[PDB]
Amino acid sequence: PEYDYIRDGNAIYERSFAIIRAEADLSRFSEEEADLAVRMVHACGSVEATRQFVFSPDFVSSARAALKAGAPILCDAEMVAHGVTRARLPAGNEVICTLRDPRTPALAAEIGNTRSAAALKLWSERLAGSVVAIGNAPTALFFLLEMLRDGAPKPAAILGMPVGFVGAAESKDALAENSYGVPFAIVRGRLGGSAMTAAALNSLARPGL
Amino acid sequence: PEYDYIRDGNAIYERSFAIIRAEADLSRFSEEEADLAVRMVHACGSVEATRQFVFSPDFVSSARAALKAGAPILCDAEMVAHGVTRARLPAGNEVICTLRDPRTPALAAEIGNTRSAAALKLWSERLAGSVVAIGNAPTALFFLLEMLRDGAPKPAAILGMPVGFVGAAESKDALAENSYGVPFAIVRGRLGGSAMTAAALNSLARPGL
Numbered sequence: 307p308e309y310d311y312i313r314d315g316n317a318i319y320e321r322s323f324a325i326i327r328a329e330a331d332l333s334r335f336s337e338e339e340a341d342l343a344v345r346m347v348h349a350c351g352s353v354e355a356t357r358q359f360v361f362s363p364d365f366v367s368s369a370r371a372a373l374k375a376g377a378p379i380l381c382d383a384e385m386v387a388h389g390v391t392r393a394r395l396p397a398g399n400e401v402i403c404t405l406r407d408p409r410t411p412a413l414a415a416e417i418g419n420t421r422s423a424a425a426l427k428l429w430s431e432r433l434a435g436s437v438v439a440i441g442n443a444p445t446a447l448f449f450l451l452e453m454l455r456d457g458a459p460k461p462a463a464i465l466g467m468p469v470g471f472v473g474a475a476e477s478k479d480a481l482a483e484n485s486y487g488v489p490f491a492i493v494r495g496r497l498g499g500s501a502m503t504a505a506a507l508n509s510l511a512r513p514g515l
Numbered sequence: 516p517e518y519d520y521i522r523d524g525n526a527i528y529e530r531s532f533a534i535i536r537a538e539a540d541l542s543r544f545s546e547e548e549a550d551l552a553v554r555m556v557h558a559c560g561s562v563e564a565t566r567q568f569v570f571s572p573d574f575v576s577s578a579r580a581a582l583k584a585g586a587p588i589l590c591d592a593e594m595v596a597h598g599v600t601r602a603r604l605p606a607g608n609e610v611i612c613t614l615r616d617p618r619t620p621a622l623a624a625e626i627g628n629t630r631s632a633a634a635l636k637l638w639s640e641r642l643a644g645s646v647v648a649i650g651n652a653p654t655a656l657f658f659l660l661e662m663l664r665d666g667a668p669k670p671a672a673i674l675g676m677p678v679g680f681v682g683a684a685e686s687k688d689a690l691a692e693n694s695y696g697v698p699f700a701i702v703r704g705r706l707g708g709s710a711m712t713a714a715a716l717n718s719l720a721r722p723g724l
């Protein structure tokens with residue numbers, strides 16, 4: 307056979323974002339949130355995810371604000387962390403994920419949680435005005451919420467986009483319910499994911515393409 | 516507030532796979548393919564993806580066959596590669612991805628393709644009975660198909676699960692149309708993804724949990 311497919315990524319990129327814009331309904335989204343929406347949709351191939359996207363009044367502004375002023379991303383997974391295209395970061399923003407950190411399994415044990423959650427303890431001195439990215443683990447999100455309630459230092463924003471069938475749904479609305487003084491963004495419901503999260507990060511740290 | 520969420524991953528894992536089995540329709544799937552289906556669904560939070568899953572008669576058998584006999588996974592992305600839980604691999608199967616390889620951008624240039632595709636050239640001496648994993652890039656899939664047509668050495672199987680709005684759809688059915696003598700597995704349509712792919716890999720390299 308003779309394959310007549312496109313071999314130019316930017317071309318691909320151009321017609322990809324194009325097809326999407328042409329299909330996803332992005333009306334209620336802020337000219338800036340939209341960007342977020344479309345790559346998110348891009349990364350997942352689902353034009354409907356948009357249905358669940360939810361950004362606190364100033365989420366984009368304040369995170370894009372911070373991700374621009376240097377603020378570190380704190381990924382709950384590594385898929386997410388490896389979805390962030392360094393080449394697109396405003397100011398070499400750190401993509402941190404202590405999931406596979408040597409002391410997380412033990413923090414999980416003594417405190418009684420999950421690696422993804424205990425991991426947040428290693429975040430202890432990096433919450434300060436940062437952009438949290440949890441696109442894989444709701445316990446992490448719930449744990450992050452307790453910290454805050456118990457006198458913790460509010461991050462710059464909170465990407466509550468973990469994906470799941472157990473706990474993700476609640477963790478996320480809980481973020482929305484009482485986010486202890488910080489903006490958020492979540493994909494309410496079961497949907498979420500490293501791709502969408504990273505995609506969202508990618509959108510934030512640099513609009514368009 | 517007082518959060519009453521579950522902090523035990525295996526518990527989470529137990530009720531996650533449980534909720535799914537309880538919701539996804541897995542009838543036409545092979546008792547073994549099913550496993551694949553459910554984690555895939557797990558990784559994405561979409562019970563419907565199953566609708567698009569498609570495995571060539573012997574895909575599972577021959578890849579699980581190979582992934583068991585040592586056969587290397589050749590990831591087209593790094594998200595996918597970082598979704599493979601080493602802890603679950605049959606025999607330390609290599610998770611290879613030459614996307615971020617120093618010579619790919621140049622292979623893309625001289626031959627006129629995309630990194631993800633030219634990258635496959637670095638696969639040249641690893642196609643031999645291997646399990647290809649393309650959960651991010653259809654040009655890679657199309658390119659892989661040309662190689663085969665032009666006298667290339669058939670991989671052990673082919674995970675045609677790239678996700679996309681341009682080319683992914685065709686690349687995938689093309690895999691199905693003429694896969695040059697090798698089994699496949701694709702998520703027909705736009706859906707696919709590193710998670711689902713990796714999830715699928717994870718399922719293959721070790722059933723259940």
Ligand SMILES: C/C1=C2/N[C@@](C)([C@@H]3N=C(/C(C)=C4N=C(/C=C5N=C1[C@@](C)(CC(=O)O)[C@@H]\5CCC(=O)O)C(C)(C)[C@H]\4CCC(=O)O)[C@](C)(CCC(=O)O)[C@H]3CC(=O)O)[C@@](C)(CC(=O)O)[C@@H]2CCC(=O)O
Pocket residue numbers: 314315316318319321322323345346348349350351385386388389390391392393500501502503504505506507508509594615628629630631632650651652653654655677678679680681682683709
């Ligand atoms: C960043 C990125 C890249 N994608 C590449 C691989 C690019 N993708 C592709 C595709 C078809 C695609 N991509 C995707 C997603 C993401 N892709 C992304 C993400 C994070 C974008 C977002 O949503 O924010 C998202 C996955 C979120 C995460 O996993 O967390 C889709 C799955 C949606 C897919 C679909 C396109 C379509 O068919 O419409 C390309 C065009 C080729 C494959 C093919 O044609 O089949 C490739 C570049 C090249 O090879 O020249 C990459 C190296 C591109 C670049 O040069 O800028 C860059 C990583 C740079 C680096 O290593 O730092």
Ligand SMILES: C/C1=C2/N[C@@](C)([C@@H]3N=C(/C(C)=C4N=C(/C=C5N=C1[C@@](C)(CC(=O)O)[C@@H]\5CCC(=O)O)C(C)(C)[C@H]\4CCC(=O)O)[C@](C)(CCC(=O)O)[C@H]3CC(=O)O)[C@@](C)(CC(=O)O)[C@@H]2CCC(=O)O
Pocket residue numbers: 385406419420421422423441442443444445446468469470471472473474500523524525527528530531532554555557558559560594595597598599600601602709710711712713714715716717718
């Ligand atoms: C492998 C894996 C892990 N997931 C962990 C992080 C585990 N997940 C979780 C979740 C809530 C989840 N997970 C997911 C997916 C995958 N998860 C996977 C994948 C690849 C499974 C598959 O589909 O094949 C898939 C993502 C495919 C890819 O990205 O390519 C979902 C997104 C579906 C999510 C949903 C669960 C639910 O709510 O129903 C756990 C339970 C905690 C977070 C929370 O409760 O909020 C965590 C372990 C722990 O902390 O004890 C991990 C370390 C688990 C382990 O110990 O075995 C292991 C990686 C080991 C390693 O580092 O090698």
